[PDB]
């Protein structure tokens, strides 16, 4: 790496670490379109096994981001649209509730709030109709968001309909494939164990649990390798050569609702660039970012703004992820961990890093 990028990376994240007592991290720099990748400590403790650019970390909730991707490509292969009624992939949701709640809502949890989680009790297509079924907004559709696994983890189940694919069918066929994400996963090959990092809660040791609606709203495993490239693709979608996944891409970072200064997009969330540093960082806070809010809807959704900041946190028990690029500056940053710690500390040392390098 150019020493600036070594020595803002290594000035800003052996501190992090430190205060945050993450076992092991992965950071890749997208710089001028050119990934360079940073690690530190254990993917396995008990083993002594370090961090590495072919370890895998869980993703948690920046798995939303495929998922609005895939969702975008199956709007770009005509194959559904944001203003179907859910229930026309869905007919069994016949509960009058659901009259008026869009794929759109779904995707961008607007639906009238849908819980944060899927409960536990939920297994079955049939647990899951019911728990849909059962459901009472709070309010009309398209006036409040508050972020959702069973909102953006339904629009992901639905989405994928038409193709005749499974979810995880769909996303290995036409976005990992594609994109030679070839060391990203739903589900981790036993080949590949061998680099899945364990998670640490309390000091355990952790994997994700299996949950209703996990791989659509939070069981994406990936390298730090394979994240930089998920960057650069939606960094500069218009060199992928698949068509409708170069479209998908476009339609998951087009804003659909504004909160504050934040847009959403398809899985991403998105701000104007420049942007205020205390705007992402205090707003990545969990009950800032778990809150119910107003949204104003875009009408129609502006498409992609180049002079964004475009970013998803993610997390799982164990685990806890960012990722965040700027389009027009061709510049971008992934931080894995393998400790979920807390997100305005990722927001704070992603901008203190790009702002430096901006
Ligand atoms: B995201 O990332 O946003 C998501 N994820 C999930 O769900 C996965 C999991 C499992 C276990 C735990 S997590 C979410 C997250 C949250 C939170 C986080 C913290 O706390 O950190 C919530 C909701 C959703």
Do not use: C
Request: hydrophobic share 40%; charged share 15%; net charge neutral.
């Amino acid at each position: 790496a150019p020493q600036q990028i070594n020595d803002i990376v290594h000035r800003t994240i052996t501190p992090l670490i430190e205060q945050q007592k993450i076992p092991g991290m992965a950071v890749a720099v997208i710089y001028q379109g050119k990934p360079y990748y940073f690690t530190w400590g254990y993917a396995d403790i008990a083993k002594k096994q370090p961090v590495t650019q072919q370890t895998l970390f869980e993703l948690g909730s920046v798995s939303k981001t495929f998922t609005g991707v895939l969702g975008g490509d199956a709007i770009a292969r005509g194959e559904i649209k944001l203003s179907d009624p859910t229930t026309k992939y869905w007919p069994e949701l016949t509960a009058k509730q659901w009259n008026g709640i869009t794929l759109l809502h779904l995707a961008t949890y607007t639906a009238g709030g849908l819980p944060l989680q899927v409960p536990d009790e939920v297994k079955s297509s049939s647990d899951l109709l019911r728990f849909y079924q059962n459901w009472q907004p709070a309010w009309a559709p398209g006036t409040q968001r508050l972020y959702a696994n069973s909102s953006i983890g339904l629009f992901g189940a639905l989405a994928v309909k038409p193709s005749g694919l499974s979810f995880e069918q769909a996303m290995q066929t036409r976005v990992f494939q594609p994109l030679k994400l070839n060391h990203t996963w739903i589900n981790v090959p036993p080949a590949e164990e061998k680099n899945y990092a364990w998670g640490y809660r309390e000091g355990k040791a952790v994997h994700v649990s299996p949950g209703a609606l996990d791989a659509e709203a939070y069981g994406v495993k990936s390298t730090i390798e394979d994240m930089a490239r998920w960057v650069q693709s939606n960094l500069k979608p218009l060199d992928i050569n698949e068509k409708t996944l170069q479209q998908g891409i476009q339609l998951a970072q087009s804003r659909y609702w504004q909160t504050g200064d934040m847009y959403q997009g398809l899985g991403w969330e998105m701000l104007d660039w420049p942007v205020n540093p205390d705007s992402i960082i205090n707003g990545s806070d969990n009950k800032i970012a778990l809150a119910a809010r107003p949204v104003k809807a875009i009408t129609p959704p502006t498409p992609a703004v180049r002079a964004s900041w475009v970013h998803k946190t993610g997390a799982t028990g164990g685990f806890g992820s960012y990722v965040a690029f700027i389009p027009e500056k061709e510049l971008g940053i992934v931080m894995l961990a393998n400790k979920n710690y807390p997100n305005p500390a990722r927001v704070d040392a992603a901008w203190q890093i790009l702002n430096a390098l901006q």
